[PDB]
Amino acid sequence: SHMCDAFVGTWKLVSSENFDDYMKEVGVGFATRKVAGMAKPNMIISVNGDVITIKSESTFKNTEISFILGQEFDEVTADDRKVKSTITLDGGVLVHVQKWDGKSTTIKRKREDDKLVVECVMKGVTSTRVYERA
Numbered sequence: 001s002h003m004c005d006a007f008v009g010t011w012k013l014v015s016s017e018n019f020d021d022y023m024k025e026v027g028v029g030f031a032t033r034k035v036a037g038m039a040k041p042n043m044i045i046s047v048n049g050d051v052i053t054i055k056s057e058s059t060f061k062n063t064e065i066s067f068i069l070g071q072e073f074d075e076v077t078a079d080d081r082k083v084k085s086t087i088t089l090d091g092g093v094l095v096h097v098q099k100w101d102g103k104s105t106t107i108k109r110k111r112e113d114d115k116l117v118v119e120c121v122m123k124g125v126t127s128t129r130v131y132e133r134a
């Protein structure tokens, strides 16, 4: 479909702002925040037909999700939440909403110049994480 072509590839985390505070707001505990916050994950995005796969590999945890846009799925997050997720494309932005225990967080992924920018929002707290091609 050429849906998501500009996201496909292997990406490495190069900068982060406010991520500890985002994780606090989400409810992540101290030790997980410390170790997860040190990580420099490799995110690998691929598409096969209508199925998008996002893998993250790091010293902390490796995660993998596969999904169809607009179609809710189960995800266990790197901090071990069991959430129900829905990912859509809105105006060229991948919008990932996670629901658990009456709570919600949204992660937006966008191409900007040669970067892939990840914005994580929990209530009034936003974190911005920048990935570059690996």
Ligand SMILES: Cc1nc2ccc(Cl)cc2c(Cc2ccccc2Cl)c1C(=O)O
Pocket (backbone or CB within 6 Å): 023, 028, 032, 036, 037, 039, 040, 041, 043, 056, 057, 058, 060, 061, 062, 063, 077, 078, 079, 107, 118, 120, 129
């Ligand atoms: C959006 C996002 N949300 C996260 C939420 C919780 C945790 Cl512990 C790590 C997260 C990470 C980092 C991460 C993701 C997967 C595996 C290891 C790590 Cl440290 C990211 C991210 O930068 O993709």
